[PDB]
């Protein structure tokens, strides 16, 4: 809607003109308000996709995502606003602008409507997140990390761009609605195959694929947490959103081209999860868990059965929240002891309890047990996958094994057990910490009561 | 050299290009370049260095031989059609040479080798002027002979200019040589689309000039040169480094930014022609072009190289002699993206 | 660029920088020089010499204005911190600016003007410090590259009087002088100074002073204005450990420099110090 | 490279004062911060937003679909044929080579 989008722009003047020591309150409060306004969008319709201006629309597929994306800003603020303090006022005030500018690009790029507009925003997101990773990440490697985050997107995105232009020349309009209606099959040959990869590879890069995911861990190792929460919880998911969009064309060719990527995914899930079982340091462990779940989304998209898209939507959102949650929840330790390496934390439960509780809830929904929307999101795509091939279950099952283990593992290794002796640094949990993660996890649990509003268009 | 003479030279350069943009007769075009040259060399020789001298030697030597081949190919055209009006040329053996001569005048590869060197030899004033104003006239004639161009020959230099405009850009430290490879790379994008649709060329030209005006005004504003010299500036006048970042990204064509407007119209035009593969390779390499803009961004704004102590006194002293035209040259070269359609003003 | 309306001045004169070379005798040299010339006498232009012209016109703390402190030179010369050099070069930059403060005035009012010590005289202190070993050789190599790069374009020198005092006699006045740090100063160093000073400085410079185009002067006049330009090469990146500063300290100290009332903004605009708001309308 | 010593530490807000609720150094602002953050983080969005979404009108048209489905069940049953067409379109309405 054009109504939600203006105020999101309007916080910027408010940020710059805010009194130097009050800005956090301004940005926080109004970001919360605009979240609540975003929530009214959720209504959708049971038949026709909701429409607005000529240049926007709001499919059910977008709405829960939009609500989420609006919802994250305050969270990143609450996480950030103690991570930085000694920074100069102008620089901080400069800093939140990156975040909000970013979500502005998201609210624009979810409602689309032209796939060229959708693209140019899809790639426009790249800048602020780059700036954030590079200027406010800790340790040296972040510099290098910036590059991996960058070219892997562009090297994917650029051909997609040319492909898009091509279609609006071989057919009429590039607009999504009509192309949903005017859609006509493309088939074999050889030109059409390169069309296929051209319209898939960028989306399959931005949500990491197993053969290509290398940048993602090395982004998460580096980025300051506000960059981490977005880079994990959202951008992956948007790549998925777009790939769900463009599949309105293609067919029947997808039937013939899915196989290689279904192999990289069905194998890469078990593989990356296996690597996930033996990390040195936590902040990476979480990242590989994230890839290990995104593989499920990507096969869920490619088998193209309606159950699979339902499960696609659900898992996208659930993994969003749970991953962001694990990240902030890890940064807390990293700030309390600067260890980063998981081994040093040791008996953290002994010294403070409530965080152990959040570890419990968060990991617990990471492994996905009923009736978490994570789980129910996952079970559908196992169903449709199983319809697609009866063998496939033997792969999915192994996932559900290892995702148990390492998940519980991150719990039992960084918590249960003896305190390290000399680490006096810990200081008994701030209110904002508990507030923050309670803010992640409560929506995630209420949300199970009413799935029917999250399953998306193919409900 | 006193300003009263300097200004007459620079104005006769302006005239020496305007003349190319006016006259229809060929002889007045070759006169246009020829007068342009004589008035271009001395302005490179202000301040005067043992280095600058051989810089001008390079420039003159190549421009002279280029103008020679051009006049020869004109004469051959006349021999086989008895005309002087621009129009179509009537003899391919001549036409390819007019393309070559102009290929030197733009500095397109593999004729390109003089441009990175010459830029090294002169101050950023004369440098900027060389990389913008000199790029007008030869393009001003190519737009007039787009009608008969032998596209193969044009796209080959048009591509190779982009690869060489890439690989030779990853390697250097001191900025001027890098600006040289940036421009030598954009010219590939201009001269690429030229056979297909000139209006896209002129659009891209305008963006390029605006951009390089942004950069060179900034380098002037900070008097940085070698990359390290640029590195110190974050503490003294943080804004301008904090703005070099952006203008660099607009060189890189990250899509919200204005510099994306060229590529994304170009890709359109060529795609109407089919020719689908060429823009894909081209757009992929443009990335490689981006990367050294990024590394250069790392030296500067995003990260703070260690300051030298002596800098502190310099903090007291504001920069002076403000260059009025600058802020607009930044802003136009960045924010203008939702004003592409206005390109049709160029018809 | 406005010179087109007038084709530069035809007037000429000379500035005078007495070269008294001593401790207490340095002061004595200044007194004779001040009385000698109508033009305002050089005040030494030391650590806060820039601060004098900055706008407040007033000295700051040593911490950022120079971060060198001479007393901390004399009390512990050969400090592990390269202050022994950090002062040298910093003073050279300031004295360079001295030139610019006054030579421009020579090209303006056309009046004579009296400098106190000037840049050509800064060769020697380092010339000795290198001999007593207070500074490492690379500090010197940095100093003469920046010397060559910067001094060469300043063309005319001189119109100035060399002088001499006995080393031992200056040692005597030094004893008379009140400051403790001055008294501590070593003799053999100072003798090495006077020796090299007389051996080379006058030996070269007098040959030029013995001789003591308008368009070139106008070009030079442009250089005198916009002083950062005269300073433009003094912040050359060579990264010797004593001069160079890590990003944290610099970002912090400059973050501190803005804290001052007259430095947030260009001087005519600043609201903190009572500049007129009418311009902001 | 001379440089400032090092960051003394992360500094406990608690070191300054017991009770600080994380947030800013200033004791005064923090109370306001947690208050606004809670009042909106819970008491407006997690409730009124949640109740709101809980009572959204059925634009899914689900109940309508149920009722109308009943409406077809009746005629299909009373007339007795045939509940489910095997054909989503009329055969005679479409030509075929």
């Amino acid at each position: 809607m054009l109504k939600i989008i203006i105020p999101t722009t309007m916080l910027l003047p408010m940020t710059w003109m805010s009194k130097h020591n009050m800005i956090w309150i301004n940005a926080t409060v109004h970001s919360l308000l605009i979240s609540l306004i975003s929530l009214s969008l959720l209504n959708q319709l049971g038949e026709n996709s909701l429409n607005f201006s000529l240049t926007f629309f709001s499919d059910s597929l977008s709405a829960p995502l939009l609500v989420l994306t609006t919802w994250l800003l305050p969270l990143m603020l609450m996480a950030s606003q103690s991570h930085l303090s000694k920074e100069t006022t102008t620089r901080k005030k400069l800093y939140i602008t990156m975040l909000i500018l970013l979500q502005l690009f998201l609210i624009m790029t979810f409602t689309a409507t032209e796939l060229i507009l959708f693209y140019i925003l899809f790639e426009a997101t790249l800048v602020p997140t780059l700036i954030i990773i590079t200027r406010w990440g800790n340790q040296t490697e972040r510099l290098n990390a910036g590059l991996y985050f960058l070219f892997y997107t562009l090297a994917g995105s650029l051909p997609l761009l040319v492909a898009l232009v091509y279609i609006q020349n071989t057919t009429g309009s590039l607009n999504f609605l009509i192309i949903h209606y005017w859609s006509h099959p493309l088939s074999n040959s050889w030109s059409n195959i390169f069309m296929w990869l051209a319209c898939i590879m960028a989306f399959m890069v931005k949500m990491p694929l197993y053969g290509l995911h290398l940048w993602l861990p090395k982004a998460h190792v580096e980025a300051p947490i506000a960059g981490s929460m977005v880079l994990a919880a959202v951008l992956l998911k948007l790549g998925g959103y777009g790939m769900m969009r463009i599949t309105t064309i293609l067919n029947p060719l997808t039937n013939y081209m899915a196989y290689p990527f279904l192999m990289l995914s069905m194998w890469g899930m078990i593989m990356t999860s296996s690597i996930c079982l033996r990390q040195t340091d936590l902040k990476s462990l979480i990242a590989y868990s994230s890839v290990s779940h995104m593989a499920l989304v990507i096969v869920a998209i490619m088998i193209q059965t309606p159950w699979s898209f339902m499960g696609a939507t659900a898992l996208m959102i659930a993994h969003g929240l749970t991953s962001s949650m694990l990240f902030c929840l890890a940064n807390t330790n990293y700030e309390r002891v600067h260890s980063r390496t998981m081994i040093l934390a040791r008996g953290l439960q002994t010294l403070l309890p409530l965080m152990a509780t959040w570890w419990l809830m968060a990991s617990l929904t990471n492994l996905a047990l009923p009736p978490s929307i994570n789980l129910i999101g996952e079970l559908f795509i196992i169903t449709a996958s199983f319809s697609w091939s009866n063998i496939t279950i033997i792969l999915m099952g192994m996932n559900m094994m290892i995702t148990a283990l390492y998940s519980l593992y991150m719990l039992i290794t960084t918590q249960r057990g003896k305190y390290t002796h000399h680490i006096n640094n810990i200081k008994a949990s701030f209110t904002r910490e508990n507030a923050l993660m309670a803010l992640h996890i409560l929506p995630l649990l209420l949300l199970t009561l009413n799935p029917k509003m999250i399953l998306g268009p193919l409900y | 050299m006193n300003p009263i003479i300097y200004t007459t030279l620079i104005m006769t350069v302006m005239s020496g290009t305007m003349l190319v943009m006016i006259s229809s007769h060929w002889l007045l075009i070759w006169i246009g370049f020829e007068m342009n040259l004589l008035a271009m060399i001395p302005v490179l020789m202000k301040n005067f260095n043992p280095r600058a001298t051989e810089a001008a030697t390079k420039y003159f030597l190549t421009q002279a031989t280029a103008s020679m081949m051009l006049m020869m190919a004109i004469i051959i055209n006349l021999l086989y059609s008895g005309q002087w009006t621009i129009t179509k040329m009537f003899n391919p053996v001549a036409m390819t040479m007019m393309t070559m001569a102009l290929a030197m005048k733009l500095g397109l590869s593999p004729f390109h080798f003089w441009v990175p060197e010459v830029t090294q030899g002169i101050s950023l004033q004369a440098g900027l002027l060389l990389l913008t104003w000199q790029k007008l006239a030869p393009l001003s004639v190519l737009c007039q002979i787009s009608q008969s161009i032998n596209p193969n020959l044009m796209l080959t230099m048009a591509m190779l200019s982009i690869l060489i405009g890439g690989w030779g850009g990853l390697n250097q430290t001191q900025l001027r040589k890098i600006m040289a490879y940036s421009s030598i790379a954009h010219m590939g994008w201009m001269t690429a689309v030229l056979p297909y649709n000139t209006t896209m060329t002129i659009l891209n030209l305008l963006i390029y000039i605006t951009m390089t005006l942004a950069m060179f005004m900034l380098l002037i504003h900070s008097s940085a040169t070698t990359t390290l010299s640029l590195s110190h500036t974050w503490n003294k006048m943080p804004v301008i480094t904090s703005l070099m970042m952006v203008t660099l990204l607009s060189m890189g064509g990250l899509p919200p930014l204005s510099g994306f407007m060229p590529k994304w119209m170009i890709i359109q035009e060529m795609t109407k022609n089919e020719s689908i593969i060429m823009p894909t390779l081209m757009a992929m390499t443009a990335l490689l072009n981006l990367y050294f803009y990024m590394r250069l961004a790392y030296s500067s704004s995003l990260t703070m190289f260690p300051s030298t102590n002596n800098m502190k006194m310099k903090w007291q002293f504001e920069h002076t002699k403000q260059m009025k035209l600058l802020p607009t040259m930044i802003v136009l070269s960045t924010l203008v993206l939702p004003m592409t359609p206005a390109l049709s003003s160029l018809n | 660029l406005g010179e087109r309306t007038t084709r530069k001045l035809t007037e000429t004169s000379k500035v005078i920088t007495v070269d008294g070379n001593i401790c207490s005798g340095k002061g004595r040299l200044a007194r004779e020089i001040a009385e000698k010339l109508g033009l305002r006498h050089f005040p030494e232009a030391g650590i806060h010499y820039a601060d004098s012209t900055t706008g407040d016109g007033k000295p700051l703390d040593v911490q950022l204005s120079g971060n060198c402190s001479l007393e901390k030179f004399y009390d512990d010369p050969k400090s592990n911190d390269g202050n022994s050099y950090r002062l040298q070069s910093w003073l050279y930059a300031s004295r360079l600016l001295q030139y610019a403060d006054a030579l421009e005035h020579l090209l303006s009012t056309g009046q004579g003007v009296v400098l106190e010590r000037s840049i050509y005289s800064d060769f020697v202190f380092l010339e000795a410090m290198y001999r007593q070993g207070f500074i490492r050789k690379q500090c010197v190599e940095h100093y003469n590259e920046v010397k060559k790069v910067t001094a060469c374009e300043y063309l005319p020198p001189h119109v100035v009087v060399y002088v001499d005092v006995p080393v031992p006699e200056i040692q005597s006045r030094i004893q008379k002088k009140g400051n403790p740090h001055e008294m501590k100063i070593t003799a053999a160093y100072l003798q090495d100074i006077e020796n090299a000073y007389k051996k080379t400085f006058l030996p070269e410079m007098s040959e030029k002073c013995e001789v003591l185009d308008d368009r070139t002067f106008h070009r030079l006049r442009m250089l005198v204005q916009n002083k950062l330009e005269v300073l433009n090469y003094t912040t050359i990146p060579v990264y010797l450990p004593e001069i160079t500063i890590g990003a944290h300290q610099s970002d912090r100290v400059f973050q501190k420099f803005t804290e001052l009332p007259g430095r947030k903004y260009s001087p005519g605009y600043n609201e903190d110090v009572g500049d007129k708001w009418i311009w902001l309308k | 490279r001379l440089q400032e010593d090092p960051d003394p530490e992360d500094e406990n807000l608690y070191e300054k004062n017991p009770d600080s609720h994380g947030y800013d150094k200033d004791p005064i602002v923090d109370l306001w911060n947690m208050r606004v953050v809670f009042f909106f983080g819970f008491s407006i969005v997690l409730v009124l937003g949640s109740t709101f979404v809980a009572y959204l009108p059925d634009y899914r048209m689900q109940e309508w679909a149920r009722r109308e489905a009943e409406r077809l069940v009746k005629y299909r049953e009373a007339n007795g044929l045939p509940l489910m067409e095997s054909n989503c379109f009329d055969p005679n309405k479409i030509q075929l080579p």
Binding site: - | F305 | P237, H248 | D7
Partner: peptide, 19 residues
Amino acid sequence: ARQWQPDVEWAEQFGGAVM
């Protein structure tokens, strides 16, 4: 965790005539 800003050995690599 005092950020990380580039060291001398880092900056020297750009200091050559050609990277």
